[PDB]
Amino acid sequence: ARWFPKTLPCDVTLDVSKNHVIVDCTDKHLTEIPGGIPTNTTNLTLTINHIPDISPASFHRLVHLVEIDFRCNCVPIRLGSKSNMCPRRLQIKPRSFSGLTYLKSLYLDGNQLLEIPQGLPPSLQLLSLEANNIFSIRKEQLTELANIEILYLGQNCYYRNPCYVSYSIEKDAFLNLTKLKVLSLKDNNVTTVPTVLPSTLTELYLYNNMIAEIQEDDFNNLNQLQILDLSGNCPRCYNAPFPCTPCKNNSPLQIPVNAFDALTELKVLRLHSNSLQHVPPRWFKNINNLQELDLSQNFLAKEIGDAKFLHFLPNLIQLDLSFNFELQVYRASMNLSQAFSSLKSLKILRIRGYVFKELKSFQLSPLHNLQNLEVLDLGTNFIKIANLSMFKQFKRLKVIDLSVNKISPVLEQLYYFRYDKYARSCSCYKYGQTLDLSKNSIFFIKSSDFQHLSFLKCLNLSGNLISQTLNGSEFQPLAELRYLDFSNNRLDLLHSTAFEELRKLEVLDISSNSHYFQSEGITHMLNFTKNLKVLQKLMMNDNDISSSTSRTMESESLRTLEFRGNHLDVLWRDGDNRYLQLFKNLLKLEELDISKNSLSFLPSGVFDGMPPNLKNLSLAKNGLKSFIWEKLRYLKNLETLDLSHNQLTTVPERLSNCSRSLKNLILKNNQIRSLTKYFLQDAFQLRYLDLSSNKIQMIQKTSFPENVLNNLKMLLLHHNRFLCTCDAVWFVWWVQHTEVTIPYLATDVTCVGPGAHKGQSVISLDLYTCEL
Amino acid sequence: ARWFPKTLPCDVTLDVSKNHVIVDCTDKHLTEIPGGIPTNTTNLTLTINHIPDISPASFHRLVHLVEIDFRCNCVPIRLGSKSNMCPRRLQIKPRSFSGLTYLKSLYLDGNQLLEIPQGLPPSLQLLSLEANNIFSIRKEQLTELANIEILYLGQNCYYRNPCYVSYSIEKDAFLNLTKLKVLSLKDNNVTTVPTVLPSTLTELYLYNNMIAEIQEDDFNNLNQLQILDLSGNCPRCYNAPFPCTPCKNNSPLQIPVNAFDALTELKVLRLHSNSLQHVPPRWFKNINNLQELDLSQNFLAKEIGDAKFLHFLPNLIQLDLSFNFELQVYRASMNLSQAFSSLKSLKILRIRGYVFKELKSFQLSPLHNLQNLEVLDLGTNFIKIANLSMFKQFKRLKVIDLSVNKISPVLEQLYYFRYDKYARSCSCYKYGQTLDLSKNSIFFIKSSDFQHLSFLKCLNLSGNLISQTLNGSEFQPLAELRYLDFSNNRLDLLHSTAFEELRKLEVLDISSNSHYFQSEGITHMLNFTKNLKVLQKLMMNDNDISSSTSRTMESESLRTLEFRGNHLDVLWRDGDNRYLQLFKNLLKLEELDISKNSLSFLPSGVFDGMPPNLKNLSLAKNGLKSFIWEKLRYLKNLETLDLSHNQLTTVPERLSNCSRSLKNLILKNNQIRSLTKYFLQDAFQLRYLDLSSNKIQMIQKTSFPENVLNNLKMLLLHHNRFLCTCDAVWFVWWVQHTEVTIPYLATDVTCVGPGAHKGQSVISLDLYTCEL
Numbered sequence A, B: 001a002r003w004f005p006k007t008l009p010c011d012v013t014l015d016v017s018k019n020h021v022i023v024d025c026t027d028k029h030l031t032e033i034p035g036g037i038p039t040n041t042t043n044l045t046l047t048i049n050h051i052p053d054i055s056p057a058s059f060h061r062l063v064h065l066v067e068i069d070f071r072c073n074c075v076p077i078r079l080g081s082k083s084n085m086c087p088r089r090l091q092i093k094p095r096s097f098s099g100l101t102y103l104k105s106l107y108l109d110g111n112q113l114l115e116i117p118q119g120l121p122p123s124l125q126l127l128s129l130e131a132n133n134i135f136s137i138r139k140e141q142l143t144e145l146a147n148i149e150i151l152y153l154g155q156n157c158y159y160r161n162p163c164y165v166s167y168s169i170e171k172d173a174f175l176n177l178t179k180l181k182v183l184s185l186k187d188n189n190v191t192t193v194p195t196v197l198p199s200t201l202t203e204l205y206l207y208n209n210m211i212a213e214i215q216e217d218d219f220n221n222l223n224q225l226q227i228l229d230l231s232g233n234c235p236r237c238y239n240a241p242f243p244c245t246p247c248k249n250n251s252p253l254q255i256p257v258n259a260f261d262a263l264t265e266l267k268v269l270r271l272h273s274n275s276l277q278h279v280p281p282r283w284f285k286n287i288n289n290l291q292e293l294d295l296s297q298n299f300l301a302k303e304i305g306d307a308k309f310l311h312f313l314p315n316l317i318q319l320d321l322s323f324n325f326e327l328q329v330y331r332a333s334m335n336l337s338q339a340f341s342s343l344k345s346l347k348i349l350r351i352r353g354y355v356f357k358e359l360k361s362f363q364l365s366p367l368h369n370l371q372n373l374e375v376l377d378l379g380t381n382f383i384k385i386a387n388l389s390m391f392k393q394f395k396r397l398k399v400i401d402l403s404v405n406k407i408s409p410v411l412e413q414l415y416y417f418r419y420d421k422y423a424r425s426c427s428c429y430k431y432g433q434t435l436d437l438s439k440n441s442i443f444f445i446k447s448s449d450f451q452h453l454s455f456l457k458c459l460n461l462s463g464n465l466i467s468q469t470l471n472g473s474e475f476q477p478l479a480e481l482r483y484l485d486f487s488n489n490r491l492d493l494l495h496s497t498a499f500e501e502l503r504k505l506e507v508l509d510i511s512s513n514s515h516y517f518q519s520e521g522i523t524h525m526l527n528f529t530k531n532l533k534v535l536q537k538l539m540m541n542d543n544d545i546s547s548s549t550s551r552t553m554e555s556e557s558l559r560t561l562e563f564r565g566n567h568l569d570v571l572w573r574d575g576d577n578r579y580l581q582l583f584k585n586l587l588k589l590e591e592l593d594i595s596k597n598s599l600s601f602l603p604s605g606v607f608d609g610m611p612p613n614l615k616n617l618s619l620a621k622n623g624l625k626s627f628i629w630e631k632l633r634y635l636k637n638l639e640t641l642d643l644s645h646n647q648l649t650t651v652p653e654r655l656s657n658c659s660r661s662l663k664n665l666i667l668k669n670n671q672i673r674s675l676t677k678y679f680l681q682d683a684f685q686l687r688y689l690d691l692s693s694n695k696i697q698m699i700q701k702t703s704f705p706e707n708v709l710n711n712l713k714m715l716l717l718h719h720n721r722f723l724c725t726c727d728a729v730w731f732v733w734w735v736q737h738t739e740v741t742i743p744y745l746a747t748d749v750t751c752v753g754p755g756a757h758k759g760q761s762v763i764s765l766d767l768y769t770c771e772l
């Protein structure tokens, strides 16, 4: 199919429209730039390899390069692998880039460089030097960068990459970079705002440094600035998950009342973790276009009840006041200033970590007439008491977030506390109004708890303490509910009328309610589904279900059932036929996950007991030691079969004689050592085949006919035991010449032998002696 | 060291005192009896193999045999592996056993035999034929068994091994077995008690059959009988986890009032799952020595409130009345008859599954003066209300079991519901008075909850809903408490005074309290240990701990810390030195488990931060990719190092130069491919070395010096990648001739190559061609 097999260990992609030739050698275990990169290459990515040096020979023929991504070939020791440490910093020889007349972007992050590389072409718009060892910026070193527009210099001096001195920037070092728009000096041990800066700047990142004072006029000329981040200067260090040294005398970052006067275009101001005790209104007197303000992790508890500065922010969209609580103070309630009611445009208000015992509707009245409010986040406040009915006045909201509180009758998990949330590396909301009570202490629910909440579309009760026999009465007011997350509670399914009052329920998650399923004698009614007439998806994963009082689950509507992490092996004990049709009467079911059910064999009758429209079946991670492939004929609509992570040793003699319809067959991580003589013969709408991580030694053409192999969208063969003898001549030739996508050819499709060929890639194999 | 290497694939043990030669071939994948079994063999075990037949040649020379254990060489299909099903039943040719003049015990269970084997020697005392296909007993087939004392014939006709007809026993089939003492016909589809049985019987097992009625004279001559089990005849089928057919019209097994009159020696009566509604006192009129009575899984709920039969049971030790509740009835309280107070000798009372809402002190008053009572089990009763102070009247008890209830302000997991709890296969009580409240709904505790319980030595609160900041006040009355199981709650360690009122506490289990450790911003005081002055063992596994407000844990008493399943990889993030001494001030710590902490590397400072008397350290299951063995020099008292299940690839050049104290080194399941030249040179304190499940190809003599191998109690080498070429001549010869204990030589110490030798045991390898 190809006359010239591709031997380059990089992925090569073509974008005709933009005339781009994309060569991606990410994580190919290279120790040298590979030979034979196409001369027309425009984008070359060499990230995460161990190439030790760059030189004029490196990109000699690649004169059309617009981008070189050469990140992390020598990452600082504390940031990189300790098993394969980089022995010596990257070496860049003179004139390696000067011939790259079209070069627009150069990423050299994470290479332990000591200086800004010189000789850079004047076409360059973007230079990235994060996580190097450059901590002195001099003007001579920047003249080469006359046309630069984006400059990343951060993470060159901080606790994961120390330089042991203060960062140094020469007076006016950046001022003649007349096109510079984005400057990032974060995580750098910087002590003063550099001046004077070019007035073209749109974004200035100065966060996580040692700046104790802003001068008057530090930002005097930046009338185009749109984003300013001064966070983490004078940090709030309590419970910090990184080594944290506060400014002396409990001092805040000191910002003169007029410091932002010039910033008329400012849209985002981030003052997270600056130990602020007051927010002077004067700050915002000539900023009228501000949309995003981050004041989290300061000491603004007393200020939130006053907050006169809010009157100057009628265009604010997002306000974050999280984690401003006074240490060791557990306030009785939340005191929001009336000034909040002047925030016409506010869509998102986050006030986590205010820390108070009781939320009362009257406390939220300053927010009552904010017409655009979409998210109210009061998580992580240790609230013990909240009458949920108070949110009848907030029907317009999209998300009411009370996650992680102590109530009883999506941001990253580390978000407010991590060092740099933007560090670069080498859900039910869509259903409508959402009330998030997850991770609270709700141990008993009753209908009155939800009075005036009929508008709710998604209720998250995950991770409460609900240990109750639901009888269909607990959720009466929730007439519109489409999504209920009940996971990680202690559901007791004594009554099959559980949940039946949620008449519009489409998704139900009762996963990780294993508690009552773990003790003998307790009754479980798994047929509670019959009464839910629009239920589309049911998740009951990790419930340890090993017994059921009812012998059939019933639904006219269910399409998806997740049943992972249960004990169907016990339910289907050989000789007990009573539960072999447990899923048979789920007549619209198309997807069934019964992985992780300890099913070491499938009793005969399982496949005949499947519902008729089953499309996606997972039997993964079952320790399956044998499989009667012929029984798949019962599954007349089957299109995806996931048998991964089992102990299978054979494939069917004729996949065409087992499942005529099957499109995706996943057999990775089994014990298959050979294929049947005619395995894929006539399997014409097979499209995806994963045989990776098995023990296959040889494959012959009869098992792998081309009538099927090139209608394959992907064929996975890596991590097997291929024997590269003269018997493998067809397989080797086909792999070398095929158009079919086979991942990891450059890295993990390898001969195990014989001898000379051990560890050699099949792509590089020369078997001419077989043809002498 | 040996002149004649052992090639027999069986373990051979010598007991000089008992004149026994024990040959154990259990599960050796044998398809024939091996040649060369010692002529002096007295005990030969061939269980779980695939030997298809027995013949006079089988034991031809083994005339001293006293026991043959030939179980499970052809298991019934539903009971056996479905990947290696037995193709044909065991074949026994005539006179295979008649020469075995000393044979006392013959186990032929699970071989699909169709008849009682004939030709057995008259020495035979024990014959076991369970899980065969023998379902008609004729007197002629039993004549060979004149001296038999123990006869196991059950599991020959039941749902896991059907015969599709009723069991048949000829009239008086057993009567001329004049020495018969133990007869078991369980799980056999038996329809009547066989009569007449020999009066020498001491134990009669008739359980799990289809006996609907006992005749008044069925047991008339059994004046020596000590154990009678009639359970599972007319079973109680509600929630049965096995196919269960009840007697018609809800009838119980029906037992005339005088059916037990002859059984004056009876000590054990088992009537579990007989659908009994009454226990007539007349049953026990001539039974005065009964010690154990099982009446579980009947319908005796109302009888328990009357129970006149108990007046005839003054010598009873154990009484089981569990799971007698009326279906769909949730009683208000438990009604124990006053007759219970006549149970003078009772030690154990189990009344699980009575099902009632409220336990009150007065309900237990019939038990108040049972002086010998040790165990009171009221688990699995859905009790909602119980004042724990009532157990001040029960200080003499060893265990008060309220496990699995619904209280709010050790038997196998399947026990009462499994089909045959005696089916054969092919904890804090020791601290003193124990109150087991595990798996209840306790969400809040206060000191008054434990008023008058100061005598308690162990409290099990595992698996409640306790989501509370303990401050040292919640357990004040528990002045004698030595063991607290607080696992699987939601401990909030805000205060370092948590648990300090438990002044005699020696063991604390706060494992699986990960809830509050999983959300950022929450304060956790890990230094709460300082206040527990006799605390010996702390378990805090599976807490997901990744942050700590305190930097050091402190204790003058702690000897064992389990810290498995946390995130020390995050706590010890490279460049953050603040927690590197977390354990340093546990000055008496001898055992530390920090397995499963995602430690892919160990930051420098970890080993210097360890406390000085550490002896047993586990770093297992960490994904460890590298290890600086020299740092072990800091651990001057280290004796056990568990590095199993990691990704290590090398051993130290000289282990002796890394640790002078190390005795036990566990390296199993790593990626080691070779040993260093002088690995064990002069490692004189080494006693135990596990290298199994690595990728080792070759071992040379320099690595394994003889003066070290001679002190090894065990050296594990199985499941490596041994290359059996002429380069391996020393290793192969040494393995064949050494006295060092090496497990699995017969099964899993194998050549992977070259070619011809693939899969061959190295013990069987002949390398003479290397020496021509």
Ligand SMILES: *[C@@H]1O[C@H](CO)[C@@H](O[C@@H]2O[C@H](CO)[C@@H](O)[C@H](O)[C@H]2NC(C)=O)[C@H](O)[C@H]1NC(C)=O
Pocket: A020, A022, A042, A043, A066, A067, A104, A105, A125
């Ligand atoms: C190839 O390199 C060019 C040059 O850097 C990339 O072009 C940039 O793409 C981003 C994506 O929106 C734009 O925001 C930048 O403005 C572009 N810069 C220039 C100078 O054009 C291009 O994305 C790269 N393509 C691939 C597939 O890697």
Ligand SMILES: *[C@@H]1O[C@H](CO)[C@@H](O[C@@H]2O[C@H](CO)[C@@H](O)[C@H](O)[C@H]2NC(C)=O)[C@H](O)[C@H]1NC(C)=O
Pocket: A157, A158, A159, A161, A162, A163, A164, A165, A166, A167, A189
């Ligand atoms: C940031 O700069 C400070 C100096 O401003 C560095 O601190 C010095 O470190 C040296 C060597 O570690 C000490 O001898 C000095 O006493 C320190 N000076 C002060 C004022 O503390 C610090 O190491 C730098 N931070 C990083 C992460 O490199």
Ligand SMILES: *[C@@H]1O[C@H](CO)[C@@H](O[C@@H]2O[C@H](CO)[C@@H](O)[C@H](O)[C@H]2NC(C)=O)[C@H](O)[C@H]1NC(C)=O
Pocket: B020, B022, B042, B043, B066, B067, B104, B105, B125, B126
């Ligand atoms: C070897 O076989 C003999 C005879 O079967 C075993 O001796 C019996 O051991 C049980 C176990 O306690 C005793 O109750 C019996 O009284 C013993 N004698 C008989 C005739 O059964 C002996 O235990 C076996 N040894 C081993 C190591 O398996």
Ligand SMILES: *[C@@H]1O[C@H](CO)[C@@H](O[C@@H]2O[C@H](CO)[C@@H](O)[C@H](O)[C@H]2NC(C)=O)[C@H](O)[C@H]1NC(C)=O
Pocket: B157, B158, B159, B161, B162, B163, B164, B165, B166, B167, B189
């Ligand atoms: C126990 O014995 C009964 C008969 O006493 C067996 O039941 C018969 O089974 C055959 C074959 O399935 C049926 O055609 C008969 O109608 C059954 N008779 C009755 C009275 O039910 C039963 O199969 C046996 N049980 C086992 C496990 O072998």
Ligand SMILES: CC(C)Cn1cnc2c(N)nc3ccccc3c21
Pocket: A469, A492, A493, A494, A516, A521, A522, A523, A524, B326, B327, B328, B329, B330, B355, B382
């Ligand atoms: C059928 C009842 C008489 C006993 N019972 C059996 N299963 C259950 C169960 N899951 N929850 C319960 C909760 C309260 C009371 C009884 C039960 C119960």
Ligand SMILES: CC(C)Cn1cnc2c(N)nc3ccccc3c21
Pocket: A325, A326, A327, A328, A329, A330, A355, A382, B469, B492, B493, B494, B516, B521, B522, B523, B524
């Ligand atoms: C110290 C408080 C100002 C805030 N706080 C910080 N960590 C915690 C914590 N684990 N549990 C709590 C329980 C109730 C109230 C506050 C907290 C709390």
Ligand SMILES: *[C@@H]1O[C@H](CO)[C@@H](O)[C@H](O)[C@H]1NC(C)=O
Pocket: A302, A303, A304, A305, A306, A335
């Ligand atoms: C709320 O806090 C503000 C700010 O100090 C204060 O002026 C006001 O009195 C407080 N109101 C209440 C009800 O606590």
Ligand SMILES: *[C@@H]1O[C@H](CO)[C@@H](O)[C@H](O)[C@H]1NC(C)=O
Pocket: A387, A388, A389, A390, A392, A451, A452
């Ligand atoms: C909660 O507030 C609602 C008002 O919407 C009221 O009807 C209800 O009684 C309140 N519940 C409690 C427990 O105060």
Ligand SMILES: *[C@@H]1O[C@H](CO)[C@@H](O)[C@H](O)[C@H]1NC(C)=O
Pocket: A403, A427, A428, A429, A438, A439, A460, A461, A462, A463, A483, A485
């Ligand atoms: C509910 O909350 C839990 C825990 O906070 C979260 O993991 C889960 O994804 C949420 N459920 C939905 C449906 O968004």
Ligand SMILES: *[C@@H]1O[C@H](CO)[C@@H](O)[C@H](O)[C@H]1NC(C)=O
Pocket: A496, A497, A525, A527, A528, A530, A531, A549, A550, A551
């Ligand atoms: C579920 O099945 C059981 C049969 O075991 C029956 O008692 C119960 O009424 C059924 N419930 C529904 C809703 O069908």
Ligand SMILES: *[C@@H]1O[C@H](CO)[C@@H](O)[C@H](O)[C@H]1NC(C)=O
Pocket: B302, B303, B304, B305, B306, B335
């Ligand atoms: C307990 O039940 C028995 C059985 O009928 C009855 O005779 C007795 O009066 C009951 N006692 C109490 C206190 O309920």
Ligand SMILES: *[C@@H]1O[C@H](CO)[C@@H](O)[C@H](O)[C@H]1NC(C)=O
Pocket: B387, B388, B389, B390, B451, B452
């Ligand atoms: C529990 O019983 C004790 C008597 O031993 C009594 O002092 C206490 O008040 C009772 N507690 C409750 C809540 O009834």
Ligand SMILES: *[C@@H]1O[C@H](CO)[C@@H](O)[C@H](O)[C@H]1NC(C)=O
Pocket: B403, B427, B428, B429, B438, B439, B460, B461, B462, B463, B485
């Ligand atoms: C406490 O009870 C739990 C749950 O039944 C059990 O797993 C655990 O072993 C018990 N703890 C002790 C110390 O006996």
Ligand SMILES: *[C@@H]1O[C@H](CO)[C@@H](O)[C@H](O)[C@H]1NC(C)=O
Pocket: B471, B472, B473
């Ligand atoms: C500890 O908590 C209990 C109940 O929350 C309270 O009665 C007691 O005063 C507290 N003790 C201290 C020292 O705070």
Ligand SMILES: *[C@@H]1O[C@H](CO)[C@@H](O)[C@H](O)[C@H]1NC(C)=O
Pocket: B496, B497, B525, B527, B528, B530, B531, B549, B550, B551
């Ligand atoms: C635990 O550590 C915290 C801060 O690290 C300290 O305030 C507290 O007093 C300590 N408690 C004990 C018992 O050492």
Ligand SMILES: *[C@@H]1O[C@H](CO)[C@@H](O)[C@H](O)[C@H]1NC(C)=O
Pocket: B633, B656, B657, B658
């Ligand atoms: C390790 O070996 C070297 C060379 O024999 C020796 O100098 C050194 O002291 C040894 N270290 C230990 C801890 O035994």
